[PDB]
Structures are given as C-alpha cells and as structure tokens.
Design an enzyme around this catalytic site. Structure first.
Site, PDB file in Angstrom:
ATOM      1  CD  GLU A  59      -2.523   1.492   2.568  1.00  0.00           C
ATOM      2  OE1 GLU A  59      -3.025   0.540   3.197  1.00  0.00           O
ATOM      3  OE2 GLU A  59      -2.524   2.668   2.994  1.00  0.00           O
ATOM      4  CG  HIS A  60       3.567   2.428   3.215  1.00  0.00           C
ATOM      5  ND1 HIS A  60       4.029   3.587   3.797  1.00  0.00           N
ATOM      6  CD2 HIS A  60       2.700   1.881   4.101  1.00  0.00           C
ATOM      7  CE1 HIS A  60       3.468   3.734   4.983  1.00  0.00           C
ATOM      8  NE2 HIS A  60       2.657   2.713   5.190  1.00  0.00           N
ATOM      9  CD  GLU A 136       2.718   4.999   7.967  1.00  0.00           C
ATOM     10  OE1 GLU A 136       2.689   3.765   7.770  1.00  0.00           O
ATOM     11  OE2 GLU A 136       2.394   5.837   7.097  1.00  0.00           O
TER      12      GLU A 136
END
Ligand code: JZR
Lengths: 441, 73
Positions: A59-60, A136
């Site tokens: 996703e990154h 994160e």
C-alpha cells in the site's frame, strides 16, 4: 413519496465480468463527479508469520510510481486533473480508489489499472517506505484505541491469521524484501480476486469497455497449488491486560464471537447494538438519552465514551463494545454494559427494538451519501456477498426484526458465551475474567 | 482497600484463557508428582529433624519408664 417508494427508486447496481474473472460493478447517478476503484480479496488474514505486513508495505508503494509512470509522474497526473487517490488495507480487504470529475473516468480507470498491474517497487523506494512504516508503528502505539483493538484480535483469534495486525510486527517491516512483495503480489493481485467499482455520473457500458481495454491483461489463472484460500479462524475466550498506570484513561474492548459477513443474523445484531448505542462526553442528550447505558453513564459520569460494534469477517467476527473511562469506573461500566446485553437477551421490548430498527434504517441510508461511500459499498459488497444488496432488501430484513427475534439472536451470541477481553492503561479495576464470564448469564 | 486504589503498576502484560477453553487438571500426575517431590525434598531437612527428635525422646522415655517399674531392668 413515502420512505417505501423512495427505496424502490434507487438505480439498480449493474454487474458484469471480464474473461479473466474481474468483476465490474457500478451505480449510475447524475453527479458530475465520481469515485472509481479496485477492491481486492487480500489482507493480513491471507498472510503468514513470515510475510505479515506485506500487504501494508505494498500500500505504501502503490502510488510511488509505475513502469509507465515512474516516480512522482503518477502523482502529478492525479493532482493536475484535481483528482484524489486514496487507499486502505484491512485484515481481509484492500482498496485503491480515485475521486475525480465524471468526464475523467477513462484516465481514472487507466491509472488504477496501471497502479494495480505495473507498480515499480523500486529498491530505493522500498528502503524509504521501510522507515516510514517504522515511524507509523511508533505513532500507532500512541493511539490507545488502535492498540486495544489490535489486542482484542490478537487474543480473540490467537493462533490464527486473524490474530495478526495489518501493519505486521516491526521485525517483518525491517526484513520484508522486494522478492517477498512481488511474490505476495503475483499470488493475490489476480483478476478473480478483484472488483472494479464505480459510482457517480457514468454508464456501466462505458466502465465495462474501459475495463476490457485496461484490465484484460490482468491474470485470471494463477494455477491450482497457489490459490490462497481462507481457513476458518478459531475464536478463544480469553483476556489480555496491558497495565500501564501512567496513562490517564483506561480503554477496554470486550466481544463475543460474531457470525460473519454472510449471516442473516447480522441485521438483528445491528438492531440490538443500536439499542445500546454509543456515547461520549460531548453528546447533548445526557440523562435523557434512550439507551440505559448511555443515560447511566452520562448522569453518573461513568465514562468519557463507549461504542458497540459488530466487526465482521468471512466466517467469524467480533461482537461487543469499547469504552474509555477513569480508573475507578471500569467495574461499574462493565457491570452496566453486561446488564444491558442480558436485558436484551431476556427482555427486549417491542418499543426499544422499533427504535433500534429506526436507528439502523437512518444509519444505512445516511451512510450511502456521496459517490465515495456508495462506491465502497459496491466494491466491498461484491467481495463479501457477491452481490450488491439493495436498500429495499435491507428494509425487508430490518422489517422482519421484532422483540422476539432480538431476544433469540442476542441469546444465541451473548448468553452464557465466553468473551474475549482486551484492556490497556490504568486497569487495576478491570474485572477478573471469571467475574466477566459470570456476567454473561 | 479497593481495586483502583491499591498501588502503581506500569508496563505489565497478562494473558489468560477462559476456564472453558482449558483443562482443570493439566498434567495432574506427570507434573504434580514431580513438583510434590521437589517441594518435599525442599523442606524435609527443615521440618523432619525436630520430629525425629520427638520420636526418639518418646521411644526412649517410654521404654525407660517401663524398665524403671520392673524388678530387673
Ligand atoms: C429477513 C428477510 C430475508 C429476505 C429479504 C429479501 O427481500 C427482498 O429482496 C429482493 C432482492 O434483493 C428485493 O428486490 C425485494 O424488494 C426485497 O423485498
């Protein structure tokens, strides 16, 4: 018109399927804007301990450049047309979607096709995202709510893929390799596992042709030995208590095993959860709120907030509640909450169930407000139910619920059942598991 | 004394299983006996001696009393 005639006027969602297995679904409106995206049957439930976090890593990388649009080229193109590109990963689904002007639907579909099939995954980008993800993880550690919910899954589904977090353990983040990612991708990002959904001012036929044009190359085979199927996940009555007296408020999440997406019982369960409801210190209702838990909590200042929930997965789920309160209010909160589940199992009244039904009706419709919520409903529904459930059907299902159905369904999932409990913070007063278990009957 | 006002504790995680998910007598003998032996060997040197002394004093004293009342001890 009456609420009934209005229900029958919602355009029916159109569904088609390409040769490679990709499903294409859309709901046409007259909005000059739209949302189109790709929903995928991929998530951490599909990951093993070795590659847990792979999907989140991807996703990154998804928007960091494709073979056709290297680096920030994809980015510049999205921005210059005033579109918005977003994504999200959960334990079972992953989605990439774009909000854009309806007239830009062709380029939007091309970009999504490009993203899902030609992601660069440049070694240097992979190293950069590695550090972003680690940071994160640190930030997420400061979110007591996210921590307690990850803990609930870790204990409730211990020993199964559902126990895993979406982001994965930090050591996996430090070690995942491009090989690991390309491998994950070749295995999960196949046409039969994807749904191209769109809602807004566009026609199905246009979307379908754009899909044929841009997604046909997508593999629809894989093989036989490498077709990631899901095994049921065992639920375990258990407790995880992370005591940290340094934190100002305690967070507690408790749940019994839910039925899973496909089960008809979810409607009655949603009605019951609506009866108990949600609450927080900023609610204007206070002592007059209809939910006994809400008014008791408000008048006696028992918590800062609480929320019931029904988290669904393929064949299981978490049905329960989460609350945030002062260290001296945990036992009282648990007492009142469990008392309410028991009252519903044995004595739900027709009037409160009607209220619950009306709350659910309002939530359903007010949720499908805008092209993004609608597009997401289309994508997710196709992955979970295999079809878009129309509002008229939802109404029929809600209509079938009465006090008798609520007592029976609640009794089935709550009564004398072992819950999974997660606590974080100044929890010295969180009740012993035996006492919580006895509270279930 | 009440839960919530006992003492300060930070950074401790506790994991538990519902009693219905587990056995009430896990390894009752395959482990119970070995631990009992451990606990026994572990205290017998502190507990037993004094009683062995009692036993000796008792048998000696009782027999001494008997002999003392006879004609030819
Ligand atoms: C608890 C009731 C379960 C069955 C509800 C079915 O409900 C029906 O579904 C059809 C297809 O979606 C709709 O066209 C129809 O209007 C609706 O009444």
């Amino acid at each position: 018109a009456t609420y009934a005639q209005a229900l029958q006027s919602v355009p029916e969602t159109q569904v088609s399927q390409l040769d490679n297995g990709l499903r294409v679904a859309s709901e046409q409106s007259s909005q000059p804007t739209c949302t189109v995206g790709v929903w995928i049957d991929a998530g951490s439930r599909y990951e093993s301990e070795k590659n847990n976090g792979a999907g989140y890593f991807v996703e990154h990388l998804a928007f960091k450049g494709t073979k056709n649009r290297p680096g920030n080229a994809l980015e510049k193109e999205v921005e210059s047309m005033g579109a918005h590109l977003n994504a999200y990963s959960t334990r079972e689904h992953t989605a990439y979607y774009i909000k854009a002007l309806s007239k830009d639907l062709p380029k939007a579909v091309e970009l999504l096709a490009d993203i899902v099939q030609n992601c660069s995954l440049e070694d240097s980008q992979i190293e950069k995202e590695r550090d972003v993800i680690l940071q994160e993880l640190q930030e997420n550690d400061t979110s007591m709510r996210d921590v307690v919910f990850n803990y609930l899954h870790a204990t409730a589904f211990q020993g199964t893929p559902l126990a895993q977090s979406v982001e994965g353990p930090s050591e996996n983040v430090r070690k995942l390799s491009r090989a690991d990612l390309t491998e994950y991708l070749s295995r999960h990002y196949k046409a039969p596992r994807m749904v191209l959904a769109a809602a807004g001012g566009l026609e199905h036929r246009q979307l379908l042709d754009l899909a044929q044009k841009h997604f046909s190359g997508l593999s629809g085979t894989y093989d036989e030995d490498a077709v990631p199927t899901l095994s049921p996940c065992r639920f375990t009555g258990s407790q995880i208590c992370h005591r940290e007296d340094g934190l100002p408020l305690a967070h507690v999440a408790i749940a019994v095993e839910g039925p899973g997406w496909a089960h008809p019982d979810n409607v009655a369960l949603q009605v019951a959860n609506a009866i108990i409801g949600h609450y927080d210190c900023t609610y204007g209702g206070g002592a007059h709120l209809s939910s006994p838990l809400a008014s008791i909590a408000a008048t006696n200042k028992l918590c800062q907030s609480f929320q019931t929930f029904n988290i669904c997965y393929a064949d299981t789920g978490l049905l329960g509640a989460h609350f945030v309160c002062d260290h001296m209010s945990i036992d009282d909160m648990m007492f009142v909450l469990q008392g309410q589940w028991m009252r519903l199992c044995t004595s739900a009244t027709e009037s409160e169930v009607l209220r619950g039904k009306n709350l659910l009706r309002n939530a359903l419709v007010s949720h499908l407000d805008g092209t993004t919520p609608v597009c997401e409903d289309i994508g997710r529904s196709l992955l979970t139910y295999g079809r878009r459930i129309p509002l008229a059907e939802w109404e029929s299902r809600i209509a079938e619920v009465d006090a008798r159905v609520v007592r029976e369904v609640c009794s089935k999932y709550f009564y004398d059942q072992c819950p999974a409990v997660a606590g974080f913070g100044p929890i010295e007063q969180l009740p012993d598991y035996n006492r919580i278990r006895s509270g279930m009957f | 004394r009440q839960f919530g006002h006992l003492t300060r504790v930070r950074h401790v995680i506790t994991y538990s299983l519902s009693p219905f998910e587990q056995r009430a007598f896990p390894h009752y003998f395959s482990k119970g006996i070995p631990n009992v032996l451990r606990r026994t060997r572990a205290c017998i040197l502190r507990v037993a001696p004094p009683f062995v002394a009692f036993y000796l004093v008792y048998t000696w004293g009782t027999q001494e009393f008997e002999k003392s009342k006879r004609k030819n001890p």
